[PDB]
Amino acid sequence: AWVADKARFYLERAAPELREWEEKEIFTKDEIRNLVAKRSDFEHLVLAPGTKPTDFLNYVNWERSLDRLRAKRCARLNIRSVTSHASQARTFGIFERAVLKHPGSIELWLAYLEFAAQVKATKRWRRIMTRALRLHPMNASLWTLAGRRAAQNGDMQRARAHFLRGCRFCTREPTLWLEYARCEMDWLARMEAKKPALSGAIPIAVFDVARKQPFWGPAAAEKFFDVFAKFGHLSCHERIISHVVTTMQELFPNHPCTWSVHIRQPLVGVDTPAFPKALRESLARLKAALQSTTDRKALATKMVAWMDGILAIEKLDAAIRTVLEHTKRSL
């Protein structure tokens, strides 16, 4: 432990900002003595041998709240000469030696990404995201954060880069695959609302490659359909939904999930006279499904969950509502 000699540099670096704040009338001298003592205690806690990511986050939160307090006080005392750049630089320094000391803590990596995104640092955010993905490649949350922020920026090629490396790594759970199909169809909806893409064959290709993965269950394909069924206002949405249903019917013929997609298929983009027409079609499918030879307890639990989802909406007729209740109660 050379921690005193190690923290001497960070205190001597933070000193001239305190000299500027003392030569302005923004912080008084007793308050600056308090800032000196608090930063000194924080540095000698941070550079200690036995340290913790919560200790690094407490120091980050204190420095960031000091920047916010000085911003409020500077706007109140009407000064424009004092800048926040030194505080952002030292907060980046705290975070860089934080991710040096504890690279295996995703809470601290995500706090670093939240800070770098919040003070408008996109290129630095991309570099931090690359380092975090290299250290935690099995983390679907980090991969979806990278891909969704690249899609939110609009660099769809970079979003596909992050997502295809993520689906190359995370193949135990379906989560990142579902989020990639969600992002690709959101790109398809953006390409539609801007008015290949005319076919929209990429989620069908995602399904065809996902057919051979170690998570490939009927529940996983039902999760694929439950992702796909949102935002039906598209062009090839019926093509995608019909391909999912014929894949599940050709592969898992008598599963309750396949009977559930047989129930809930024809209600794609409905909200309105086309609503109860397709509801009567789906209820015919549902009654045939309930009488048919399938695990009725599993199919009934699926249908009462979907019927709670149905009952969550207003603006319907009471006869339809009470016949949903009557068909619910005997399950």
Partner: protein
């Protein structure tokens, strides 16, 4: 309004932490004897570096049978050395495993005068026989050469190009001749137009490609431009020069190791005067080599000494010697610029270190800060008398000490004769010619 200063021991340790907090006040009232305490630390630093000055590191293998008369490193790799002895056997050494040689062959009949590595992996060797090419790194070991060259007179030295597969061999017919491997057979013979004396050494400039320097036993240095194949300029010095070399960071500076016991650092654009004159030896200088950082020099001399130099010094930074080392013929750095290698006449290749008191490896911060602090403190207070005498004291062998005392007596006598002839002759009404200007006899094109 009473208030006194209260010190908790929280100012030394906060409770719950093992960090001993060290509060520092830099006011000069608290720290007396600044210059005196720093002088004492500088004196301790000199005595510490004289105690831990232990420069000999090892010896490559069993060595050779007769003396090592040529050796050459691989300038692309970092641990490939080769050395050719006096009974005409060459050996390729690997510096990571110094226990035994990697590849040896009974190359020639006579001594191996020059030797070099190609840029691919192969090595070349001169003799009076003629030059040969071997593949020392092959999955079967092959003793036989894969190319040989006898036409072109008796060759003396080699030098390989930096990038391409070109190399120049200095012959004894007064010409150098330049081959390109894989599409040239006899090479192109470049010479000064009416030149007879042998060209001893040859050296490609590694920074500026296609500029070749050479020394010759006409006590002369000659240049060569490879782009327009002709010689360029020729200057005659006073004594014969044993070896030319170029600076690997400054393209225009060269150094000649010469029989005047001296190293002359020249500028290749203006051969009027020497840029520097390193004078520290006792017998003739056999080999000179710049450091790959371009700021230091090794010279192996014809007496039993290696002398380490800074580039602007003009006097020895270090001298290395050993009772087992018989003469010194070829000294060269490693590409670390930390260790030097010495091919002797005892048949030994020895591995010394430059910066004799500076140990290698990874240092902790408070270790390398102490070493850098000592070096900066010696840079400041190195000229004071106690510090000066302890940092200049080095144990020389008795023959070298007696002969440098004789050399000081003879040089003082010659200076007194010249000063008396100046004070009592007609040369009194002239400006004193500087010694760097006196280093060159004539320059011609």
């Amino acid at each position: 309004k009473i208030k006194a200063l209260t010190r908790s021991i929280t100012a030394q340790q906060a409770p719950g932490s093992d960090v001993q907090r060290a509060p520092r006040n830099l006011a000069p009232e608290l720290h007396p004897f600044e210059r005196a305490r720093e002088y004492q630390r500088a004196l301790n630093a000199v005595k510490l570096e004289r105690m831990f000055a232990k420069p000999f590191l090892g010896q490559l293998g069993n060595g050779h049978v007769q003396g090592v008369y040529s050796m050459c490193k691989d300038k692309n790799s970092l641990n490939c050395i080769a050395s050719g002895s006096g009974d005409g056997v060459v050996k390729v050494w690997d510096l990571t495993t110094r226990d035994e040689e990697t590849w040896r062959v009974a190359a020639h009949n006579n001594i191996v005068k020059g030797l070099t590595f190609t840029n691919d992996k192969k090595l070349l060797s001169c003799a009076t026989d003629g030059i040969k090419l071997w593949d020392p790194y092959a999955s079967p070991s092959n003793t036989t050469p894969i190319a040989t060259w006898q036409e072109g007179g008796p060759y003396t030295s080699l030098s390989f190009h930096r990038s391409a597969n070109t190399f120049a061999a200095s012959s004894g017919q007064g010409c150098i001749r330049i081959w390109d491997l894989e599409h040239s057979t006899a090479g192109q013979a470049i010479q000064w137009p009416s030149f007879v004396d042998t060209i001893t050494d040859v050296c490609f400039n590694q920074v500026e490609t296609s500029v070749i320097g050479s020394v010759a036993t006409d006590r002369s240095i000659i240049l060569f431009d490879l782009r327009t194949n002709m010689p360029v300029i020729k200057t005659v010095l006073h004594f014969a020069c044993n070896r030319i070399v170029f600076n690997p960071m400054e393209a225009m500076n060269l150094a000649v190791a010469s029989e005047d016991h001296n190293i002359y650092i020249f500028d290749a654009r203006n051969f009027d005067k020497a840029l520097n004159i390193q004078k520290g030896h006792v017998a003739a200088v056999m080999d000179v080599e710049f450091s790959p950082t371009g700021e230091e020099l090794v010279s192996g001399s014809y007496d039993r000494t290696i002398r380490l130099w800074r580039r602007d010094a003009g006097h020895s930074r270090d001298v290395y010697h050993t009772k087992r080392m018989q003469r010194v013929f070829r000294t060269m750095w490693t590409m670390d610029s930390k260790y030097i290698l010495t091919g002797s006449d005892d048949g030994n290749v020895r591995l010394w270190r430059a910066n004799a008191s500076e140990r290698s490896g990874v240092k902790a911060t408070r270790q390398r800060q102490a070493l850098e602090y000592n070096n900066a403190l010696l840079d400041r207070y190195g000229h004071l008398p106690e510090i000066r005498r302890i940092r200049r004291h080095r144990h020389l062998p008795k023959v070298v000490k007696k002969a440098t005392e004789i050399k000081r007596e003879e040089l003082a006598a010659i200076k007194r004769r010249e000063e008396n002839e100046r004070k009592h002759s007609n040369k009194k009404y002239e400006k004193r010619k500087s010694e760097r200007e006196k280093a060159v006899l004539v320059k011609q094109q």
